[PDB]
Amino acid sequence: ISEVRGNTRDHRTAAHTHIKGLGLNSSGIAEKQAAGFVGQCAAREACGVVVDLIKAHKMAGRGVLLAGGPGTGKTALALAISQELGTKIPFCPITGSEIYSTEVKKTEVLMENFRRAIGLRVRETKDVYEGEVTEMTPETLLIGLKSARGQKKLRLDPSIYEAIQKERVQVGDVIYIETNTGACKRVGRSDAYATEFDLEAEEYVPIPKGEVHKKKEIVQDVTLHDLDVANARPIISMMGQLMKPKMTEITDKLRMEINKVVQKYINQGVAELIPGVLFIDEAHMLDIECFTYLNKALESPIAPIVVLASNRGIATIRGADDLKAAHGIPPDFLQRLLIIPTHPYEPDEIRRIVRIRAQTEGVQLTDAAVDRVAEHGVRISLRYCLQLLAPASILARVNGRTQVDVQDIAEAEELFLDARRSANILT
């Protein structure tokens, strides 16, 4: 579990790195401009209440729905819900279109995302005693350990004395003993007393490196999916390795081996598992079979916070014989969650956002350029205008400038056109 390192899809949250959380005071009322947020007071305060409902454990089989248009702070508020829940919490942003896979089933892909939303907080402090054995009999046992770069003799507690007698010991055996109720023995194992005659033996163990007394500090924050993806290999290259269509490395029997060891760490009290947040954009795209999986998922106490988002008003239920419902959510699951409405930003609110994103991205710009780009944030979507910051900075650097002006941003619209305008131009 120490070797297991967390691999996170940072490209999804890359557009929200400018947001630090949810800007609100002690009473609960949202601030005008805090934590990288502009406006959206009604929706900010609303989910600022749901974070408390999770903390108070009052979200008994409940979820959240973010109703609003494109670029209305939906995905942004979802990340704020995680950021406000605790430190190093799992946030899994998905889109209904991601479920629509070619090889894996509609929920074999929804399963790993649920595993990507449930984490594990580890806080294990162990006192290592590695090396050989040099027995002495006092009034309750003295053993001298020999390591690769050190030698130390220690007067063991009578608790260890009972544990060592159970697992046969002799002078010249490599051992791993722990003060925190730990007993492990390697009978006769020692590379020092190994002859070159026998090779197939493997009955000997090398002399442990460093010192005998070692203070092992384990502070690990990994999701359940990280445990599955690390135990699948028969690991640095794996962050860029996926070129295989089948993806048969993750099998149901491999997950059972993870579920049992995770349970063992909870029973010991070493590490407790912490459920996070599962965000589903394009919630209407989800099949009826997916919603019934979610209904079963929400009933489990281990389950994370299922936050959905739908840009549609009235939509046909996917997986049903054409049944129009609100946001495309079936009634069975619509009642299961509380709806939070996300309001569109007026031109005055849009330029306040631009200045925050430019400051984070590292793009210097004139006051007049912010006004021109905000005009595109109201005529077209908020995502399109925000995308104009990076090409205009290159166009300015090329012209020798650091400050981006109207002339530089005018070319950005000419070169990089939105999906709506690009279609109409072709006629």
75 labelled as ligand-binding?
yes
Per partner kind, with CB cut-offs from 5 to 8 A, the member of ligand ATP, a second copy, none near residue 281 is ligand ATP
Q: Using CB under 6 A, which residues numbered 307 to 326 contact ligand ATP?
A: 309
Q: Does 163 bind a second copy (CB under 8 A)?
A: yes
Q: Does 63 bind ligand ATP (CB under 6 A)?
A: no
Quick one: which segment of 160-168, 234-242, 318-326, 362-370 binds a second copy (CB under 8 A)? 160-168
Q: Is 57 annotated as a binding residue?
A: no
C-alpha closest to that of 384 among 392, 376, 395: 376
382 contacts ligand ATP (rule: CB under 6 A) = yes
* One-letter-per-residue 3-state SS of the chain: CCCCCCCCCHHHHHHHCCCCCCCECCCCCECCEECCEECCHHHHHHHHHHHHHHHCCCCCCCEEEEECCCCCCHHHHHHHHHHHHCCCCCEEEEEHHHHCCCCCCCCHHHHHHHHCCEEEEECEEEEEEEECCCEECCCCEEEEEECCCCEEEEEECHHHHHHHHHCCCCCCCCEEEECCCEEEECCCCCHHHCCCCCCCCCCCCCCCCCCCEEEEEECCEEEHHHHHHHHCCCCCHHHCCCCCCCCCCCCHHHHHHHHHHHHHHHHHCCEEEEECEEEEECHHHCCHHHHHHHHHHHCCCCCCEEEEEECCCEEECCCCCCCEEECCCCHHHHCCEEEEECCCCCHHHHHHHHHHHHHHHCCEECHHHHHHHHHHHHHCCHHHHHHCHHHHHHHHHHCCCCEECHHHHHHHHHHCCCHHHHHHHHC
Q: 62: annotated binding-site residue?
A: no
Ramachandran assignment for 266, one of left (phi > 0), alpha (psi -120 to 50 degrees), beta (any other): alpha
The site that binds a second copy (CB under 8 A) totals a number of residues, namely 6
Flag whether 71 is marked binding. yes
Task: Work out what residue 39 binds among ligand ATP, a second copy, none; the CB cut-off runs from 5 to 8 Å by kind.
Answer: ligand ATP
Structure tokens at 103: 């090889």
Q: Identify the residue among 17, 165, 241, 251 touching a second copy (CB under 8 A).
A: 165
Q: Which stretch binds a second copy (CB under 8 A): 13-21, 22-30, 158-166, 360-368?
A: 158-166
> Does 327 show up as a binding residue in the annotation?
no
User: Looking at beta carbons only, is 65 or 145 nearer to ligand ATP?
Assistant: 65
Interaction mask 352-371, ligand ATP, x per CB under 6 A:
-x--x---------------
Question: Would you say 17 is a known binding-site residue?
Answer: no
Judged by CB under 6 A, the residue of 37, 114, 129, 384 near ligand ATP is: 37
Four-CA torsion 368, 374, 379, 383, nearest 10 degrees: 140
Closest CB to a second copy among residues 185, 343: 185
159 binds a second copy (CB under 8 A): yes
- Residues 171-200 close enough to bind a second copy by CB under 8 A: 181
Pull the structure tokens for residue 160: 């260890």
Question: Which one of a second copy, ligand ATP, none is in contact with 163 (Cβ closer than 5 to 8 A by kind)?
Answer: a second copy
Task: Choose the binding region for ligand ATP from 32-40, 124-132, 161-169, 222-230 (rule: CB under 6 A).
Answer: 32-40
Residue (166 or 215) nearer to a second copy, CB: 166
Which residue among 84, 112, 228, 281 contacts ligand ATP (CB under 6 A)? 281
Binds 382: which of a second copy, ligand ATP, none (CB < 5-8 Å by kind): ligand ATP
Question: Total residues contacting ligand ATP (rule CB under 6 A)?
Answer: 22
Q: How far is CA 136 from CA 145, 152, 154, 173, in A?
A: 12, 13, 10, 14
Beta carbon nearer to ligand ATP, 122 or 339: 339
From 79-87, 115-123, 156-164, 406-414, span contacting a second copy (CB under 8 A):
156-164
Q: Is 49 annotated as a binding residue?
A: no
Binding site residue list for ATP: 15-16, 38, 71-76, 345, 357, 383
The binding site comprises 15-16, 18, 38, 70-76, 345, 357, 383
Contact residues: ligand ATP, CB under 6 A: 15-16, 19, 36-40, 70-76, 281, 309, 353, 356, 382-383, 386
